[PDB]
Nucleic acid binder design. Structure first.
Length: 849
DNA sequence: CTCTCCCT
């Protein structure tokens, strides 16, 4: 036990904390509390009965609207204005199977439609079933929900299907994503929505009574949500015989889902794509004749292969395959040569280069842009070269989509983002490195890492398809087919890679109280060690009690669309009147930072963040400062130049501001805020007290703590509270700085790459962790009285301050408990405000003087 | 001294 700095408080401050605490203890209605005790008192089939009565609207049909919609669909098939496409929709493969699809849906609760790119299943199946129900005179009983993984998919498909009905968005076709919607009409309608939207609507309608048809699309990508959703359908569908489910999948281990749902009817629908030829490293090197210069294992893999292909390739190319450098992206000059090769031979078309991450996208960009070779010098002026990365601006502009200037060849250097999420349509050539970056979770070390790995067979399959979009393509794989046969079928499904605290809490609102029993039902069961690690986190932040049951605060956290830790941070910000900054922090950790990382500009983007951090040693208040400055630039009509000068995405900032408005609207409806405007003066009376903002941020990121011991840009000897040595991620404002007021930090995410890095952090003060943390005891270790937090960090503290802090933590726990059970805004002159004022007083002693 | 990427 090595004691830290002295946290004792002046006697004058302790007396007034005492005057204030015992004002608070002199104190003497609830719809939320009755909702909470009802949920805990009912068993599961009481739960089923109650939610059936409460969501009954589809029990009502509208015969006159049935017959009217049936009658202008009958006639409005008789123009030629919506026909040109009915004969154009008939040219899509899915339409040939209309009646079999219709008939299979009537005879089966669940069917599966499997099909490759271009088959038309997403756009055509919803209309096939909708137009059938209208024609049978069932229009008003038909409400179809179609889920998509990505937001932009939902809007684009909705807009395109509505074009296909000669309607504007909002009649028979709509979309719903989070924070934006164009809703269809209530009945005889199709809604495209993101999977999360549907999961959140499950909290009000846990048996899906408010739709007649559920279409789950792209289940083969095995996102958490569709895996959860199929898991829940096994619970829901027994109580919903009228409900129709259509699963939709690419041809990627499709049989997993057929098996998972008994064995249900499976339709296979042929795609529409032009042929794309696949070449491997042998083939590429036999064409380019490039020469390399400047464990094995690998040799165990390659030599059997080179003996089986001995007579199909020249010996000198098979010898290059014995170098480990020859496969993947380890030699960027090799990729550069094959780019130059495609520009010389081969017809007109764009090159799509798949590389795992930012670092070597940078290297190939610089080699094409500042060429080392005469061949490169040659081709420099005839290429328009686009890096494509989530942290880069290229996808936010339209150049990378349009066709190049005449005489110029387009070269796209991208991450995995161009496999599905972003799509360039004039690509005829894919150079596939076979390498990506992926996150994996070591359950035993509690270390998250980001490592470069080989892609899966499904990845290359989809990357191959990216070339066949306008015209027959070529896919160059920078690895041998021996490496291909050592690749996994599909990536490890993300629910085995994921923190489960949010999911487990959400399942309590669906009256699924055993996460063990339920998660074991998934197609891929998560490690039960991860399930109690999630349970244990929820117990610590007190969303569950020790027996495992939902607490009143846990019910609030499950109803907030954010991870429970930051939801807790968000509610504290209401109680403590700093709503705007803390919601700024939560939305950014919950989504992403507004800053780009444009090629070559890092030293300069590093310097913008340090100026936006306003020397506050917090990545989280850096984002809030960024948002304050962004609002000022709109209020100044300077928005474009502001974003330019500071390498900011105005589209990221706009979405952060709507999440902030949404957190503010939810907290208002839950009766925690007097106003729904997250900028409201009453909600922000402390938003400029920096020590108080460190306290609320720490309350949410607790227990992720780190301690620095070090003086010198500077190097850092720092370690997390589990003893592991960490460093600030070089993208953090805190990396390399010296002279912190405090050696203590909280962080949202630690990650291993070159080193174990803290990706975001706020400098915190010991009294703040002590008040809002746990594991707090007073004692004596040498002959020095101490106060500790988490039974880890011990601070010199005199008995009078120790005792008052311990009394203070007790009434805070009583206060939080009643705000959870009886939500009200803290009234500014009442008794609860006096214990708020006690805490601000103590925290304000750490102000930078 | 470094950054796979969806989503309520």
């Amino acid at each position: 036990i090595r004691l830290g700095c002295n946290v004792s408080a002046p006697s004058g401050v302790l007396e007034r904390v005492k005057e204030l605490m015992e004002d608070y203890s002199r104190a003497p209605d609830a719809k939320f509390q009755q909702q909470f005790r009802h949920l805990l008192s009912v068993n599961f089939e009481e739960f089923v009965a109650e939610t059936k009565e409460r969501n009954a609207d589809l029990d009502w049909v509208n015969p006159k609207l049935d017959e009217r919609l049936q009658l202008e669909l009958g006639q409005r098939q008789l123009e030629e204005n919506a026909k040109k496409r009915l004969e154009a929709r008939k040219k899509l493969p899915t339409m040939k199977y209309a009646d079999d699809i219709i008939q299979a849906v009537r005879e089966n609760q669940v069917i599966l439609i499997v099909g490759s790119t271009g088959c038309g299943k997403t756009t055509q199946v919803p209309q096939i079933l909708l137009d059938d129900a209208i024609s049978r005179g069932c229009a008003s009983s038909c409400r179809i929900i179609c889920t998509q993984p990505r937001r932009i998919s939902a809007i684009a498909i909705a807009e395109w299907v509505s074009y296909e009905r000669c309607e504007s968005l909002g009649n028979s076709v709509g979309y719903q994503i989070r924070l934006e919607s164009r809703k269809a009409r209530e009945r005889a309608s199709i809604t495209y929505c993101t999977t999360g939207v549907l999961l959140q609507q499950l909290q009000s309608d846990p048996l899906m009574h408010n739709l007649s048809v559920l279409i789950l699309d792209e289940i083969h990508e095995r996102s958490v949500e569709t895996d959860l959703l199929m898991g829940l359908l096994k619970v829901i569908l027994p109580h919903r015989p009228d409900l129709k489910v259509i699963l939709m999948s690419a041809t990627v281990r499709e049989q997993d889902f057929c098996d998972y749902f008994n064995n249900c009817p499976m339709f296979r629908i042929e795609g529409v794509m032009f042929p794309v030829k696949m070449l491997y490293l042998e083939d590429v090197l036999s064409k380019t004749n490039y020469e390399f210069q400047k464990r094995m294992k690998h040799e165990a893999m390659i030599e059997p292969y080179l003996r089986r292909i001995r007579n199909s390739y020249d010996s000198r190319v098979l010898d290059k395959l014995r170098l480990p450098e020859s496969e993947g992206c380890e030699d960027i000059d090799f990729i550069a040569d094959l780019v130059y090769y495609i520009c010389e031979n081969e017809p007109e078309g764009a090159i799509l280069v798949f590389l795992p991450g930012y670092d070597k996208i940078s290297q190939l960009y610089n080699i094409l842009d500042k060429p080392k070779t005469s061949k490169g010098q040659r081709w420099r002026d005839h290429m328009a070269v686009f890096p494509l990365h989530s942290l880069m601006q290229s996808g936010e502009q339209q150049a990378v989509f349009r066709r190049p200037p005449a005489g110029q060849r387009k070269v796209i250097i991208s991450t995995i983002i161009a496999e599905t999420s972003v799509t360039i349509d004039d690509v005829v050539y894919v150079i596939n490195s076979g390498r990506t970056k992926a996150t994996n979770y070591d359950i035993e070390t509690n270390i998250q890492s980001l490592d470069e790995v080989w892609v899966t067979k499904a990845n290359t399959q989809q990357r191959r398809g990216r070339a066949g979009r306008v015209r027959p393509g070529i896919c160059y794989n920078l690895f041998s087919r021996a490496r291909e046969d050592r690749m996994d079928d599909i990536p490890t499904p993300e629910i085995l890679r994921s923190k489960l605290e949010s999911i487990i809490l959400s399942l309590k609102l669906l009256h699924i109280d055993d996460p063990y029993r339920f998660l074991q039902t998934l197609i891929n069961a998560p490690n039960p060690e991860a399930i109690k690690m999630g349970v244990e986190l929820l117990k610590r932040i007190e969303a569950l009690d020790q027996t495992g049951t939902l607490t009143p605060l846990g019910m609030h956290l499950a109803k907030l669309p954010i991870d429970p830790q930051m939801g807790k941070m968000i509610l504290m910000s209401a109680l403590f009147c700093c709503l705007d900054p803390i919601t700024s922090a939560a939305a950014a950790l919950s989504f992403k930072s507004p800053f780009y990382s444009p090629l070559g500009k890092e030293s300069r983007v590093d310097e913008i963040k340090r100026r936006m951090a306003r020397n506050m040693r917090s990545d989280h208040l850096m984002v809030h400062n960024t948002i304050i400055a962004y609002r000022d630039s709109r209020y100044s009509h300077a928005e474009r130049d502001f974003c330019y000068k500071n390498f900011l995405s105005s589209m990221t900032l706009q979405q952060l501001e709507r999440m902030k408005n949404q957190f503010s609207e939810l907290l208002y409806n839950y009766k925690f805020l007097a106003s729904s405007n997250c900028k409201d003066a009453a909600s922000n009376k402390n938003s400029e007290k920096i020590p108080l903002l460190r306290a609320i941020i720490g309350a949410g990121l607790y227990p992720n703590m780190a301690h620095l011991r070090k003086s010198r840009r500077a190097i850092h000897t720092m370690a997390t509270d589990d003893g592991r040595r960490v460093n600030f991620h070089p993208s953090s404002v805190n990396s390399g700085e010296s002279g912190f007021d405090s050696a203590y930090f909280v962080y949202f995410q630690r990650q291993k790459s070159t080193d174990l890095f803290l990706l975001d952090s706020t400098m915190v003060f010991p009294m703040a962790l002590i008040i809002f943390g746990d594991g707090v005891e007073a004692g004596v270790t040498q002959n020095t009285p101490y106060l500790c937090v988490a039974k880890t960090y011990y601070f010199k503290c005199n008995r009078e301050t120790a005792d008052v802090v311990i009394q203070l933590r007790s009434n805070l726990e009583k206060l939080l408990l009643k705000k959870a059970l009886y939500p009200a805004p803290i009234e500014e002159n009442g008794y609860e405000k006096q214990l708020i004022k006690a805490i601000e007083l103590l925290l304000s002693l750490d102000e930078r003087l």
